Design a protein around this ligand. Structure first.
Ligand code: NAG
Ligand code: NAG
Lengths: 31, 44
């Protein structure tokens, strides 16, 4: 199921309401 | 990728460890307004 993000809507990612911080976020994905 | 790394390094460098929660100095321009006229909640 595709989901709508702030960098365009993506296919293959799940939305789990998980929050990471800086200096642990690889694949910064834009925004 | 180098631009993203430089931006991350800058915003990690300008961070502060400890903060505090005015006097007769009027600092309403520097702080967040009470009623937001913008779509960003943290913009001054
Ligand atoms: C993930 O789901 C929650 C609850 O359905 C929603 O509030 C949130 O906006 C979703 N994430 C994104 C990036 O839209
Ligand atoms: C500080 O300046 C703003 C500028 O518009 C003004 O609205 C506000 O009343 C001032 N604060 C005081 C305490 O005078």
């Amino acid at each position: 199921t595709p989901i709508q993000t702030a960098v365009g809507c993506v296919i293959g990612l799940v939305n789990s309401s998980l929050v990471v911080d800086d200096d642990k976020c690889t694949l910064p994905l834009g925004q | 990728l180098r631009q993203d790394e430089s931006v991350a390094n800058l915003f990690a460098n300008i961070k502060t460890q400890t903060t505090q929660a005015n006097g007769d100095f009027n600092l309403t321009l520097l702080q967040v307004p009470k009623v937001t006229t913008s779509q960003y909640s943290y913009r001054s």
